[PDB]
Ligand binder design. Structure first.
Ligand SMILES: [Mg+2]
Ligand SMILES: [Mg+2]
Ligand SMILES: [Mg+2]
Ligand SMILES: [Mg+2]
Ligand SMILES: [Mg+2]
Ligand SMILES: [Mg+2]
Ligand SMILES: [Mg+2]
Ligand SMILES: [Mg+2]
Ligand SMILES: [Mg+2]
Ligand SMILES: [Zn+2]
Lengths: 93, 50, 106, 99, 69
RNA sequence: AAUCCGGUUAAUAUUCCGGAACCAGAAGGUGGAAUCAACACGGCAACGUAAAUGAAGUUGGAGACGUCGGCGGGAGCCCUGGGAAGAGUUCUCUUUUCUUUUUAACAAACCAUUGAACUACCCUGAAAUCGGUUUAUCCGGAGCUAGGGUAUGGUGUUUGGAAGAGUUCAGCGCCUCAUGCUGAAUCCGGUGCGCUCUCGACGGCCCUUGAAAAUCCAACGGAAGAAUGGCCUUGUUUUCACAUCUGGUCGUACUCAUAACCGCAGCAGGUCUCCAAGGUGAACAGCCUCUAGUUGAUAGAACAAUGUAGAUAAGGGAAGUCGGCAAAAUGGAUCCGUAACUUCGGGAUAAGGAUUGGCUCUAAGGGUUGGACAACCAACUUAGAACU
């Protein structure tokens, strides 16, 4: 069954704080608790540990990744990397 | 408290000793007015204050 | 039923005031004051607990014989078996690559 | 599966206080087998007299404390309390003492 | 306290110099315990036979102090 | 770093006594081990052993860490079925009711058996018709399932300690003395969404991610060593076993509170924390009880008005009053039913109804276990029927 039409995970807050505030928290909370894919291992075992820190499970790639507060990568970081790579590849040649 | 320092314990020993009656022959001396003393301390009444 | 008291003057449920109940050969129920539980040494590369070594408080390790505190292998008692295997293979392959890069530099 | 429960009562009989004959029918009427009085079909509990002994033979793993309980009832029926007392002496054997 | 499971092992500990005394304990179950007091430990050997107990008692060093409980 | 049980005093006890241990330091007192040239072997491996040379330097580990949630185990407690010993009751009934039926530190061997593991790791092997699997959906070609191993190990088992102790009962000397002496028992089973503590594997949460240091250990490294005449001949190891010496100094009585503290006091105030039985019940609620404690709060007689505290009331029902102030009424649980409005989460136990004892039955829902089945034992719910 659905159990909620709108509030989703934010149902824990009940009727407090205002709908817009709960909706904004809802979008972020879905992001920060999601599973993401490890580029180094290929498994979807990447979960957050405290705000910019994303860890991996298993016997392989027990590494920790520095990421965004609520998602593994940010758009600003992704755009910076390609900007940096372009600049690196143009002084290289 | 039964947890006590040596210095505290020494003071308690002295306090107990001064908390005794005077022997009568002390007050029987010619020219002595040691008949009664205002230094009889009791544990519930007047506190040592360390 | 029988109720118990701390056997020491420590009166609070701290981590140094751990107890368990014993029944004595006098049919007495009383406390026994016990230590914190030991810890197995952990791998320096992976953090895994190291096999073959008991969980003891740090100073209890001073009473064991040498072989109870280690494993008969390189880095035994300091690295796990799989960590050592990664180190050996990594060292060999990296050294070989240094050999080819030196050969192709001339 | 044979049991040797005996209620020795020499002490009271010498003083003409304990009727072993009365105690016989008391036990046979009172001893309960399978929750019922009168199920002594002689395959399980026999009972008998031993002159001064009321030896009871049991085949269903009886309880000698049940004998002591029934004996104290009998002594209570005849107001023999304050005067007599059932005391364990040997394995399955009880005695009457004036104390 | 330590248990000794071999009669040969028990006799060797008795022949040692730290072995002061021995104790004989006869349990209700007709089993016999030979207890040896050294400096650090009390060593018990359980002998489940009366014949074996007699032979073991005779097998002790002659100067050993064997005390009966 | 390291201590337990039993006993003992008028009054101390993990401190005394009896017994049984442990730790740390020093020297090296024996024994053992390795080394004929050098510092051991086993196992594919995880890793194993009675020991198994290791200087400087370095590196790693332990110490060392939040909080909530449920799940699994252990210990003590609780409950239950027999036996025994003593006691209570006994007009009648009650194979009855009550009490006792105990086992420490430490040591050894096992160990997922008996309870709790495929928890971690290793080996074989190579998985789609994908499988495995928790109460909780995580895991696997980065090697699943399966088969076999390795490690972690007690508040588990079997023992030592240890029945010689403790407990219960029954007798003997009988001014009795050192209060001595002599007999029996102290046994065998079961139970769990129980309680208290604890351990194990997990899950949730955080713009919150939850001390430090002393101290102990391991590794990497290779300093240094000197037995040799095929054997009577040294060093090391005391991180192997047994043995010896030593462990100072201060605290330790008692109260911890409706009389030992603070509040002028033997003041209805205040002052941190540990253990925690039975019944009812959801319950550490209220109510009653067992163990323990207490029966202490100036007393006697009487029952006037007015009080303080607590009850009840015809008919009416807020007319009382600034005002329903105070009181009354409601109340647990089960099944029905539940409006406006809303930030869609709530509102909501909305409102509003019905039921509820006792007894005797019926049905369904799980485990141990003997030859499609099954005689017990161990069990707890839920729903319904009849009778009263
Ligand atoms: Mg005292
Ligand atoms: Mg004291
Ligand atoms: Mg005061
Ligand atoms: Mg009225
Ligand atoms: Mg009325
Ligand atoms: Mg009305
Ligand atoms: Mg009005
Ligand atoms: Mg008016
Ligand atoms: Mg009111
Ligand atoms: Zn990964």
């Amino acid at each position: 069954t659905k159990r909620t039409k709108k509030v989703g995970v934010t149902g824990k807050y009940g009727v407090r704080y205002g709908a817009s505030l709960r909706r904004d928290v809802r979008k972020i909370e879905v992001q920060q608790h999601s599973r993401y894919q490890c580029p180094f291992c290929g498994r979807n075992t990447v979960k957050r540990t405290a705000a910019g820190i994303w860890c991996c499970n298993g016997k392989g790639c027990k590494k920790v990744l520095a990421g965004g507060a609520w998602t593994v990568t940010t758009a600003a970081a992704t755009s910076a990397r390609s900007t940096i790579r372009r600049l690196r590849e143009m002084v290289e040649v | 408290p039964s947890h006590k320092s040596f210095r505290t314990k020494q003071k308690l020993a002295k306090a107990a000793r001064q908390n005794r009656p005077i022997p009568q022959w002390i007050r029987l001396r010619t020219g002595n007015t040691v008949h009664y003393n205002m230094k009889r301390r009791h544990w519930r009444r007047t506190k040592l204050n360390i | 039923a029988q109720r118990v008291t701390y056997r020491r003057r420590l009166a609070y449920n701290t981590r140094s005031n751990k107890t368990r109940i014993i029944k004595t050969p006098g049919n007495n129920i009383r406390y026994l004051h016990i230590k914190k539980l030991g810890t197995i040494p952990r791998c320096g590369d992976t953090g895994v607990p190291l096999q073959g070594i008991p969980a003891l408080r740090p100073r209890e390790f001073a009473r064991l014989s040498h072989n109870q505190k280690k494993v008969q292998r390189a880095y035994g008692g300091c690295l796990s078996a799989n960590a050592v295997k990664d180190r050996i293979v990594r060292a060999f392959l990296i050294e070989e690559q240094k050999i080819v890069k030196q050969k192709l530099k001339q | 599966v044979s049991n040797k429960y005996i209620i020795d009562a020499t002490a009271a009989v010498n003083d003409k206080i304990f009727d072993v004959a009365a105690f016989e029918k008391y036990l046979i009427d009172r001893i309960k087998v399978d929750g019922k009085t009168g199920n002594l079909g002689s395959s399980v509990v026999v009972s008998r007299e031993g002159s001064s002994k009321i030896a009871v033979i049991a085949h269903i793993d009886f309880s000698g404390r049940y004998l002591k309980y029934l004996t104290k009832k009998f002594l209570k029926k005849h107001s023999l309390r304050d005067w007599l007392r059932v005391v364990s002496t040997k394995k399955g054997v009880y005695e009457l003492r004036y104390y | 306290p330590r248990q000794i499971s071999d009669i040969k092992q028990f006799l060797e500990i008795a022949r040692r110099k730290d072995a002061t005394s021995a104790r004989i304990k006869k349990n209700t179950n007709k089993d016999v315990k030979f207890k040896l007091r050294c400096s650090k430990y009390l060593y018990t050997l359980v002998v489940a036979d009366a014949k074996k107990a007699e032979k073991l008692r005779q097998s002790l060093p002659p100067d050993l102090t064997v005390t009966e409980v």
